[PDB]
Design a binder for this molecule. Structure first.
Ligand SMILES: Cc1cc2nc3c(=O)[nH]c(=O)nc-3n(C[C@H](O)[C@H](O)[C@H](O)COP(=O)(O)O)c2cc1C
Ligand code: F3S
Lengths: 153, 1472
């Protein structure tokens, strides 16, 4: 993508630039040339359309310009996704969305099943630390309320 | 005025379509003819489906049983005044329905309310009833419909048999019903309360409202019709009816059976064009074809020789054009079969048609895009209909076919490509024809003897024959026609001089031909006529020629192909036959033709080849007329063709009248012999003979196309045998007997006079020993030649009387001019009173009479600035009015000179080109004038040679120096009377103090046109004659077009008096006015003001040199030189003295007559008598049609109202009441309103106030801005000046930005619109017509004729239609999309940029006068970049924004179009 749509902050980008990194914006990988160890990365150059009426740019790969960079060691850092929790925690009744983030109510932060709660990063996605802290505090309050109400009667 | 149709796409009945139809009808009241009564309409109607449940519940209530099948309901108009007519018609209907076996359920009287109808629409109100017929035989639907149609036809015939009047049938079918009447559009649901019911649900609806030219309504004449609805007005019906009269005698189909016999006269009597077309359409549909196929067969597409359509459509169009003659004319059609619903357009695409699809499966189409209220959150696609396009909806399966999909689906039914290959051409045949067998040339003496026999002079060969073979074009003359009319002349005038041509006033637009020459065809087919209700390969097996005119070699090759089936006919009569030889010869030839056609012949060749010293030649026109009429009347014209060999054909007016009479091909061999004889003497130089013949044929075809285009006909097949001429001076008997359809309002010579003339000339040529041809005078004065109106002595004596300032000299002039033998119509009448004379000092003074004279318009392109200024100064000195004519005027002359001599002009013209029309040009006059047609060249545009355009004129007209300027024949703003009313409203809004004058040309049928324009709030009518001068015109249009004003003036007067409309308008006449007697006669005829014209030019120094087009006038009147302008001798006192003498002559004649004022004599026709030339000439001219006196009654015989006729106020009024700080403090403003389609010319009156206050360029851009939300009306922001900014959210209808004068208009869709801005039409047709400055940004596609006659404007639009940038002159235009055929045609200045993804511009552009390349200069790149950035800034578009994002790779997708004349004059050259 472009520079202004970087998902992280922008002070670290300037820091990396000052430290010696070289950046290549709006490029997509196509293949890896080598025999048994990677020797180079063949990539393309894409072009972004104007922002849509809903605020979403649709990129399209340019037909002419495709290049190759010499690479000794490449590191795939695309992203992260939740695991398959119900089929690994032995409980196939935990309600899940499509991507893997389980469903939860807004107030009590209670999972579909009784007694179990879930809040943090597995419910949001690729968030930051402070969001996790807030979710933890809210889930703590909800668990306290539920336990008090249960031992109450 | 308008058509409209609503359809449910899926095909399920519902009340929604009907209620939306009523709503759409309730909002067309602005285009109609508003009346002081408020109840009188001119016709309205709706056409819907049959509400089965309604009538079934009615029948149940009556007491019968509701049947299982569908019902049939017939609506009838019975007479109201009698009670036997009602009973007789009921009896006829009942014995005619029961003869088939169906069951009649009963009659029903429709509930009505007569509270809303006026008087004159109520005196002829018929009795409306309905008859309910049920089907008990259990037949299918198609059979039931067929028997219903047959029953309707037989009932009509039976009722007509008893001559029972006032009877009509509005529908009789099981599928649809029609509610129509003579009420206003909005009062339809009040007269017919039935439509207010809850059970009237349908799946389709058609609605129509008309705009009639007269004020006598007839109820059976209101649309929609049964299976048709028409807007526009058809040209060729006098030719199509005649061809249907020949097609009827062979058509037959097994679907009808024996009953076919009772449909033989398919086109009855008492129908309009929209009735005959409807009848033919219904007959062709009921026999097997579908509505799209019939629409293609009757109104076809324009078959062009380009690669922009698949060959399938080309083969289909070839078949359709081969089987039937088209029905040309402006036509927007909305028709419906029992299954299909079609909306279509004609060939040229003149009327507008816009449609819309909503998410409810609902399509709404009509003439305006804002009739039905619909939110943009419901739309799917907006569109339009180009030339020849159509859109269809299939209700049985519920589908929607656009243009291309319908074409592909229609070109699959039959193998058209394999069928068309049966056609055979003639160039193949003439090439296989060996170069052998050519006969030897005729002798010189024989050629001269044959030429003398027809009266051909050497001036017919050096003036009108040499330019044809030398150049490829026709001759040119530059002065009016002062020759005597044919009957009053004394030499041998050929029979082709008695036929004046036709043209079209406001009711129809003439077809320009120098630019849209691609839609005009001259195809001719022999062996064509046959059964029109068939489909097989034998229907397209014929011979095809590329032009109706044939040479000698081509004629011999075609005679080879014909051969053993053709029959030749003699066309000569013995000179010694006696007093009745010509009639006997006519009888003999018209009997032999019939006896030979019945014998198996299929080709008739009518030759005068045996003309000798004892056999005179029958005039070819009379022969072909008699033969064609007899063949039509004997049911044999459908079998053969008609080929004519003539020896008199030398001018392009001969072939026109011959093909108009009915001939198929014409061969002129004497002209070719003369060409060859002139070539062998070494007169053409070094060109071969074949090149000369090719040039001659090309010139003939171009002139034929010109003559055919004056009326509006674009195909020769529908023009042939229609008789689009008028005979002036022929006997009523001769014309009504031998010619199909022509009117002779004054009868003339019969057959004896023609025989005498022919025999006299033949004897003079063959018994008198000729040695050379006479020089002859017909275009130039010659002593041996013919007489003329302007001779030498008259001119000298007039100039002397004017320059010496003496009256007795002027009376000597009058005595000289009023003593020649009769030469015009006004020479035979005689003044005769019965009162006693009164003294000279008692009549009106010279001032009150001189203020009745004006001078007509004479452009500055023709005249010199000095003469124009002299006329303007002289006419303003005596208090009268002058005229500026076309070509604009000098702004610096807008203030009085220092001698007080004001050089301004009190009358400004709105020409067809709008060459200088701006906002200041219309606010610096007292009295306006619309020019529809000129006296000399009717149905044609003014010309200006390429060397007459100096730098001053180029700056004054905003054009290119050294370029020929030819005005467009049509107006592009006036396509029908409703557009004329719109333009008159525009003109009355832009100038709140002036009057509007309409200028017509005298001809037959002008009375109805005058009664129509008088309802459009016009207050002065001007009737010009045929003898008016001009600056440059072809000789054929000068000598053979128009009629004397004596006819038209009297016709207009009588028709206006008949309709109680004379007391609202004034009448003005001009053309050939020389003396006081002429003015008194014209005043008796009905006129009130008078124009002089050419006589003024003689008073200033012009001596009739007739070399105005050469730019070498010796005196220097019509000149643009300096050498010659220095020789001017004019002075205003000369013109003042001329007018003084002319007025005091009228005083003299009035005082001798017995009156004291011109108001005492106007209209008093009974003071005129007719005396004929004597018992030695015997012309039977009866001018009684000219002297008929229609009694006014209560009203006077002239105008009696004060000031102009004000019009209702638009939204502008409120704006003027709101933007007061702008006019008092002069501060910035910002307004917001809601627009609607019932509001015309938004922002024009404000522009007038701004112009009067600050001027055109006094305010900074964007000083006052207005924001409109909604579909606006027509003429949005017309004549807007700089400092005004209109912003519309929605769309505009038509004529948006007409005549922009520096303003700024922006049109964009709403922000909540789910529409692709580059795929939906936002503005209509004729955008930016004649604009000189400003900017216009739109976010959609435009209609047809986008940016015509642009002069200084700048426009950025996301699309275009056909004929875009036609005849543009200046400015820049950026089109980010596709274009149509004939793009940039006639472009002569400016620049264009097209954005091409399809790489298909070289297929659409007209590479004739413009060049197209790719951008190679950064200077021209900054221009485009800034223009698109401004577009993105204003309209906030998304297409243009994404183009600006990817600039580096899209800059190479643009084509730059630059005119050819602008290749030296560009300042940063386009090349490297
Ligand atoms: C030199 C010349 C130029 C003319 N220019 C125009 C013109 O620009 N527009 C127009 O409507 N008529 C034009 N006319 C025609 C006059 O307006 C008027 O119809 C004609 O002069 C009347 O003929 P008369 O002088 O014999 O009466 C022109 C006529 C002449 C002779
Ligand atoms: S005929 Fe024409 S060229 Fe001049 S002298 Fe008269 S205006």
């Amino acid at each position: 993508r472009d520079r202004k749509n970087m998902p992280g902050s922008q002070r670290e980008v300037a820091h990396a630039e000052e430290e010696g990194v070289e950046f290549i914006w709006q490029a997509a990988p196509e293949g890896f040339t080598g025999d048994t160890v990677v020797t180079g990365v063949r990539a393309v150059r894409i072009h972004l359309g104007v922002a849509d009426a809903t605020g979403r740019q649709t990129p399209q790969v340019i037909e002419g310009s495709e290049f190759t960079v010499q690479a000794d060691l490449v590191i795939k850092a695309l992203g992260f996704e939740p695991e398959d929790l119900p089929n690994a925690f032995d409980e196939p009744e935990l309600k899940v969305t499509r991507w893997g983030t389980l469903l939860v109510d807004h107030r009590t932060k209670m999972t579909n099943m009784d007694g179990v709660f879930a809040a943090g990063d597995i419910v949001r996605g690729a968030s930051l630390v402070v969001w996790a802290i807030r979710d933890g505090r809210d889930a703590a309050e909800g668990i306290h309320a539920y336990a008090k109400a249960k031992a109450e009667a | 005025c308008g058509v409209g149709f609503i359809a449910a796409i899926d095909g399920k009945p519902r009340r929604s379509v009907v209620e939306k139809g009523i709503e759409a009808l309730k909002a067309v009241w602005h285009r109609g003819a508003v009346d002081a009564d408020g109840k009188t309409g001119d016709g309205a109607g709706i056409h819907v489906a049959v509400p089965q449940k309604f009538f079934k519940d009615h029948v149940k209530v009556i007491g019968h049983r509701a049947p299982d099948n569908k019902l049939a309901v017939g609506q009838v108009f019975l007479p109201r005044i009698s009670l036997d007519a009602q009973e007789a018609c009921r009896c006829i209907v009942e014995t005619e329905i029961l003869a088939f076996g169906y069951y009649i359920y009963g009659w029903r009287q429709v509930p009505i309310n007569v509270d809303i109808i006026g008087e004159k629409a109520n005196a002829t109100r018929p009795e409306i009833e309905q008859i309910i017929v049920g089907n008990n035989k259990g037949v299918s639907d198609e059979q039931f419909e067929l028997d219903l149609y047959i029953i309707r036809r037989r009932i009509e015939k039976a009722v007509k048999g008893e001559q029972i009047n006032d009877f009509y049938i509005c529908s009789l079918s099981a599928r649809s019903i029609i509610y129509k009447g003579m009420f206003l559009a909005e009062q339809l649901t009040t007269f017919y309360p039935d439509l207010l019911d809850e059970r009237f649900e349908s799946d389709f609806a058609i609605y129509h409202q008309r705009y009639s030219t007269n004020t006598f309504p007839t109820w059976p004449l209101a649309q929609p019709f049964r299976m048709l609805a028409h807007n526009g007005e058809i040209n060729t019906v006098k030719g199509n009816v005649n061809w249907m009269k020949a097609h009827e005698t062979r058509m037959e189909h097994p679907a009808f059976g024996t009953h076919m016999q009772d449909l033989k006269p398919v086109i009855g009597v008492g129908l309009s064009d929209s009735g005959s077309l409807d009848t033919v359409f219904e007959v062709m549909v009921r026999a097997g074809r579908t509505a799209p196929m019939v629409k293609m067969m009757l109104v076809p597409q324009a078959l062009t020789s380009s690669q922009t359509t698949p060959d399938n459509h080309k083969a289909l169009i070839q078949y359709c054009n081969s089987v039937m003659e088209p029905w040309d004319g402006p036509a927007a059609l909305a028709m419906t079969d029992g299954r299909w619903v079609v909306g279509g357009m004609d060939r040229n695409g003149l009327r507008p048609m816009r449609y819309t699809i909503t998410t409810d499966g609902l399509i709404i189409g009509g003439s305006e895009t804002g009739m039905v209220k619909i939110d943009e959150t419901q739309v799917i696609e907006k569109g339009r209909l180009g030339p020849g396009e159509m859109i269809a909806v299939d209700l049985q399966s519920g589908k929607l076919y656009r243009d291309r999909e319908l074409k592909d689906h229609l070109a699959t039914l039959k193998p058209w490509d394999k069928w068309v290959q049966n056609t055979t051409h003639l160039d193949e045949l003439v090439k296989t024809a060996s170069l052998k067998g050519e006969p030897s040339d005729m002798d010189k003496a024989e050629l001269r003897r044959r030429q003398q026999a027809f009266g051909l002079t050497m001036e017919d060969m050096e003036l009108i024959l040499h330019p044809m073979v030398e150049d490829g074009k026709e001759a040119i003359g530059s002065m009016g026609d002062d020759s005597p009319i044919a009957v009053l002349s004394d030499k041998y005038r050929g029979l082709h001089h008695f036929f004046r041509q036709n043209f079209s006033q406001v009711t129809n637009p003439p077809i320009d031909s120098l630019r849209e020459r691609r839609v005009m065809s001259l195809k001719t087919r022999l062996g064509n006529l046959g059964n029109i209700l068939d489909e097989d390969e034998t229907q397209t097996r014929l011979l095809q020629l590329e032009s109706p005119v044939l040479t000698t070699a081509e004629f011999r090759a075609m005679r080879d192909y014909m051969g053993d089936t053709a029959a030749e006919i003699d066309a000569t009569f013995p000179v010694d036959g006696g007093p009745e030889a010509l009639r006997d010869a006519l009888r003999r030839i018209r009997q032999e033709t019939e006896d030979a056609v019945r014998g198996g012949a299929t080709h008739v060749i009518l030759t005068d080849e045996a003309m000798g010293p004892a056999r005179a030649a029958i005039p070819a026109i009379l022969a072909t007329g008699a033969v064609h009429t007899h063949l039509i009347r004997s049911n044999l014209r459908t079998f053969t063709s008609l080929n004519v060999r003539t020896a008199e054909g030398l001018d392009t007016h001969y072939f026109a009248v011959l093909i108009g009479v009915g001939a198929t091909t014409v061969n002129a061999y004497l002209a070719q012999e003369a060409i060859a004889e002139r070539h062998r003497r070494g007169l053409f130089g070094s060109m071969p003979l074949e090149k000369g013949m090719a040039n001659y044929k090309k010139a003939i075809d171009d002139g034929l196309l010109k003559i055919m285009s004056k009326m509006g006909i674009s195909v020769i097949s529908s023009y042939r045998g229609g008789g689009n001429f008028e005979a002036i001076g022929l006997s009523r008997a001769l014309v009504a007997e031998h010619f199909p359809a022509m009117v002779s309002r004054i009868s003339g010579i019969g057959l004896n006079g023609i025989q005498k003339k022919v025999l006299e000339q033949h004897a003079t040529a063959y018994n008198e020993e000729v040695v050379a041809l006479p020089v002859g005078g017909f275009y130039r004065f010659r002593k041996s030649g013919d007489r003329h109106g302007w001779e030498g002595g008259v001119i000298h004596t007039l100039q002397q009387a004017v320059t010496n300032d003496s009256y007795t000299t002027f009376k000597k002039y009058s005595e000289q001019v009023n003593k020649r033998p009769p030469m015009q119509l006004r020479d035979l009448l005689e003044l005769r009173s019965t009162k006693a004379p009164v003294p000279v000092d008692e009549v009106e003074s010279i001032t009150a009479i001189r203020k009745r004279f004006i001078t007509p318009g004479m452009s500055m392109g023709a005249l010199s600035p000095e003469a124009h200024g002299t006329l303007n100064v002289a006419m303003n000195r005596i208090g009268a009015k002058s005229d500026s004519g076309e070509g604009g005027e000098d702004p610096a002359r807008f203030r009085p000179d220092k001698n007080g001599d004001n050089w301004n002009s009190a009358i400004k013209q709105v020409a067809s080109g709008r060459f200088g029309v701006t906002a200041e040009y219309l606010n610096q006059c007292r009295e306006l004038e619309i020019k529809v047609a000129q006296g000399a060249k009717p149905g044609e545009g003014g010309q200006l040679p390429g060397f007459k355009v100096t730098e001053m004129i180029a700056r004054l007209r905003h054009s290119t120096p050294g370029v020929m300027l030819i005005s467009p024949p049509p107006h592009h703003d006036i396509y029908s009377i409703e557009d004329l009313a719109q333009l008159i409203y525009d003109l009355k809004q832009i100038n709140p103090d002036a009057k509007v004058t309409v200028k017509l040309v005298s001809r037959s049928g002008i009375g109805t046109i005058a009664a129509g324009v008088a309802k459009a709030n016009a207050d002065i009518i001007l009737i010009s004659g045929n003898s008016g001068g001009t600056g440059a015109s072809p000789q054929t249009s000068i000598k053979f077009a128009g009629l004397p004003w004596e006819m038209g003036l009297s016709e207009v007067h009588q028709v206006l008096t008949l309709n109680r409309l004379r007391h609202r308008v004034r009448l003005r006449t001009d053309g050939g006015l020389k003396t006081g007697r002429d003015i008194v006669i014209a005043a008796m005829l009905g006129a009130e003001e008078f124009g002089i014209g050419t006589a003024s030019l003689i008073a200033m120094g012009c001596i009739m040199v007739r070399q105005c087009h050469s730019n070498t006038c010796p005196v220097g009147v019509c000149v643009q030189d300096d050498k010659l302008r220095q020789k001017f001798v004019g002075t205003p006192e000369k013109v003042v003295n001329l007018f003084t003498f002319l007025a005091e002559e009228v005083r003299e004649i009035l005082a001798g007559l017995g009156f004291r004022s011109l108001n005492e004599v106007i209209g008093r026709t009974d003071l005129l008598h007719q005396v004929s030339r004597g018992a030695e000439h015997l012309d039977d001219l009866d001018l009684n049609p000219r002297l008929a006196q229609v009694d006014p009654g209560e009203n006077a015989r002239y105008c009696t109202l004060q000031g102009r006729n004000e019009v209702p106020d638009t939204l502008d009024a409120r704006i003027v009441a709101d933007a007061r700080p702008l006019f008092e403090e002069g501060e910035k403003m910002q307004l917001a309103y809601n627009a609607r389609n019932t509001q015309r010319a938004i922002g024009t009156r404000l522009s007038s106030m701004v112009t009067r206050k600050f001027g055109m360029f006094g305010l900074q851009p964007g000083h006052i801005t207005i924001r409109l939300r909604g579909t606006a009306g027509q003429s949005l922001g017309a004549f807007a000046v700089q400092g005004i900014k209109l912003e519309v959210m929605g769309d505009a209808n038509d004529y948006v930005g007409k005549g922009l004068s520096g303003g700024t208009i922006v049109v964009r869709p709403t922000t909540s619109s789910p529409l692709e801005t580059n795929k939906n039409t936002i503005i209509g047709n004729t955008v930016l017509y004649g604009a000189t400055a400003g900017k216009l940004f739109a976010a959609g596609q435009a209609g047809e004729r986008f940016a015509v006659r642009n002069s200084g404007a700048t426009v950025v639009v996301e699309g275009c239609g056909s004929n875009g940038c036609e005849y543009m002159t200046g400015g820049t235009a950026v089109i980010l999309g596709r274009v149509g055929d004939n793009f940039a045609a006639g472009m002569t200045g400016g620049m264009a940029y097209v954005y091409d993804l399809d790489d298909s511009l070289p297929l659409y552009i007209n590479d004739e006068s413009v060049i197209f390349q790719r951008i190679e200069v950064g200077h021209y790149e900054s221009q485009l970049k800034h223009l698109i950035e401004e577009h993105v800034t204003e309209t906030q578009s998304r297409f243009a924004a994404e183009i600006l994002n990817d600039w580096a790779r899209e800059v190479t997708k643009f084509w730059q179009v630059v005119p050819k004349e602008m290749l030296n004059r560009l300042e940063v050259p386009v090349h490297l």
